[PDB]
C-alpha cells in the first residue's frame, strides 16, 4: 500500500551512458576513472536485478535516441526503469562527445503521457556530472 | 488521472552550480559511495535511505587533494530530487 509494486517478471532495464573521451571542439578533457565507475555500477545494478547495457562515448543525438527508444519499448513486465549518466556537465545540461544536451530533454521521454508502460512505476536517473563550476570550501 | 511528472527520482552527484569530483585512480566520489552502500544494503533499505547514506559518505569521507591550491581541500554534497509517490525497495 505504501511500497511500489515489485511483483513483475523483470526488475527493469538500466542504461549506463559512460562518456570518457570528448571531441576537441567541446574543450573538455578525458574523464579518467569513469571506466572503474561504469564497471562497478554495472555489477551493482546487475546484482539488484537490472538488465544493464553500457554505451560508451555517446553523442547528444545518440543519447537522445537511446533514451527515446527505451521510452518506446514495452515495460509491462518491468517494475521500474533506471538510467545512469557519467559525463561532463554544466548546470541543467549533460555533455555528449560533441557538445551538451539538456537533462530535462533526456528524461522527458519517460513522462506519464509519453511512456504508458512505465506509468505509476518509478523512473530513476543517476547523474554523475558537474552542474557548474563553484567549489565547496567546507567548514570544520 | 495522475500527473505526467510523477514517479521520477533524480540522484545527482552534486548540488546545482557546483563541481563534481572524480579520482582518476579509484573513480568518482558519488559512484564510489553509491556502490558501497548498494553492495551492502541495496536489497534491504529503501531508496531514500540508501541515497541518504550516500550523501553522508560523500560529505564526510572525501576531501580534494590537488596541486593547485585553488582546488585543495574541497568538499562535495550530492543532491536527491524525488517525485516518487511510494517507498521503493529493490526486493
Amino acid at each position: 500500500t505504501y511500497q511500489y509494486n515489485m511483483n513483475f517478471e523483470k526488475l527493469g532495464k538500466c542504461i549506463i551512458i559512460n562518456n570518457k573521451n570528448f571531441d576537441k571542439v567541446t574543450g573538455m578533457g578525458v574523464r579518467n576513472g569513469t571506466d572503474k565507475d561504469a564497471e562497478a555500477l554495472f555489477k551493482c545494478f546487475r546484482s539488484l536485478g537490472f538488465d544493464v547495457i553500457v554505451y560508451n562515448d555517446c553523442s547528444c543525438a545518440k543519447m537522445q535516441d537511446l533514451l527515446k527508444k527505451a521510452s518506446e519499448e514495452d515495460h509491462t513486465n518491468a517494475a521500474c526503469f533506471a538510467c545512469i549518466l557519467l559525463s561532463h556537465g554544466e548546470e541543467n545540461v549533460i555533455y555528449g562527445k560533441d557538445g551538451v544536451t539538456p537533462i530535462k530533454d533526456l528524461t522527458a521521454h519517460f513522462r506519464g503521457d509519453r511512456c504508458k508502460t512505465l506509468l505509476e512505476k518509478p523512473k530513476l536517473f543517476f547523474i554523475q556530472a558537474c552542474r557548474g563550476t563553484e567549489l565547496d570550501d567546507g567548514i570544520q | 488521472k495522475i500527473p505526467v511528472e510523477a514517479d521520477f527520482l533524480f540522484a545527482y552527484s552534486t548540488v546545482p552550480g557546483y563541481y563534481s569530483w572524480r579520482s582518476p585512480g579509484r573513480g568518482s566520489w558519488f559512484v564510489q559511495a553509491l556502490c558501497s552502500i548498494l553492495e551492502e544494503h541495496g536489497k534491504d533499505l529503501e531508496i531514500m535511505q540508501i541515497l541518504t547514506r550516500v550523501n553522508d559518505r560523500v560529505a564526510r569521507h572525501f576531501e580534494s587533494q590537488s596541486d593547485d591550491p585553488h582546488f585543495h581541500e574541497k568538499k562535495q554534497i550530492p543532491c536527491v530530487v524525488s517525485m516518487l509517490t511510494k517507498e521503493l525497495y529493490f526486493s
Binding site: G33, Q128, A129, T133 | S20, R22, P24, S66
Partner: peptide, 4 residues
C-alpha cells in the same frame, strides 16, 4: 583529483 579532477572535476567533471
Amino acid at each position: 583529483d579532477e572535476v567533471x
